[PDB]
Design a protein around this ligand. Structure first.
Ligand SMILES: OC[C@H]1O[C@@H]2O[C@H]3[C@H](O)[C@@H](O)[C@@H](O[C@H]4[C@H](O)[C@@H](O)[C@@H](O[C@H]5[C@H](O)[C@@H](O)[C@@H](O[C@H]6[C@H](O)[C@@H](O)[C@@H](O[C@H]7[C@H](O)[C@@H](O)[C@@H](O[C@H]8[C@H](O)[C@@H](O)[C@@H](O[C@H]1[C@H](O)[C@H]2O)O[C@@H]8CO)O[C@@H]7CO)O[C@@H]6CO)O[C@@H]5CO)O[C@@H]4CO)O[C@@H]3CO
Ligand code: NA
Length: 129
């Protein structure tokens, strides 16, 4: 593939997921690349009924960015402490090697704003030869 995720999927590293989720109230859960689409899920702490969960993504080293709405997905077996939101983002026909593709996650609820920015580095998608 000419594109890989430059980070481990948090759902495969539960101890790291749990720490970040408890601290930030939002954390990326799944992320995968298939056929120039990036898809995944986000877990949020259930602090209010109405929620706005977005991926903020750049394809040009933050010269510009797009906010993409995530969609609530009820788990029939889920609890009430957290909620899961999905996203699906089509990638550009070609992506840069000289610029960076990076994203982070925002969560608006209860008059508060929470973010997952991967410890200040954002989540990077890198090119492969
Ligand atoms: O019935 C009481 C309820 O009535 C009013 O709410 C109605 C609202 O005004 C309508 O617009 C519509 O809701 C739509 C909504 O406006 C849209 O934005 C969208 O909603 C999405 C959410 O934004 C998104 O967060 C997610 O929602 C899921 C939650 O994430 C998840 O946690 C769970 O929600 C449960 C709450 O966590 C829990 O607290 C409890 O909610 C109570 C509220 O806290 C309380 O304020 C009151 O709610 C009023 C509301 O204020 C009125 O405006 O009572 C609630 C019940 O006790 O229970 C929640 C449900 O289990 O689940 C939700 C998904 O159901 O996804 C949604 C969907 O995309 O779409 C909404 C639906 O069209 O209808 C509601 C009434 O149903
Ligand atoms: Na919403």
């Amino acid at each position: 593939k000419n594109l890989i995720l430059d980070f481990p999927q948090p759902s495969t590293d539960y101890l790291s997921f749990r720490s970040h989720f408890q601290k930030n109230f939002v954390c990326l859960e799944n992320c995968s690349l298939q056929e120039r689409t990036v898809t995944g899920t986000v877990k949020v702490k259930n602090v209010s009924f109405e929620k706005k969960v977005q991926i903020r993504i750049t394809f040009d080293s933050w010269k510009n960015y797009t906010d993409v709405d995530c969609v609530y997905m009820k788990n029939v077996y889920g609890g009430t402490d957290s909620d899961t939101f999905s996203f699906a983002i089509d990638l550009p026909p070609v992506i840069p090697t000289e610029q960076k593709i990076e994203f982070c996650i925002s969560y608006h609820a209860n008059g508060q704003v929470f973010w997952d920015n991967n410890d200040g580095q954002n989540y990077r998608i890198v090119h492969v030869q």
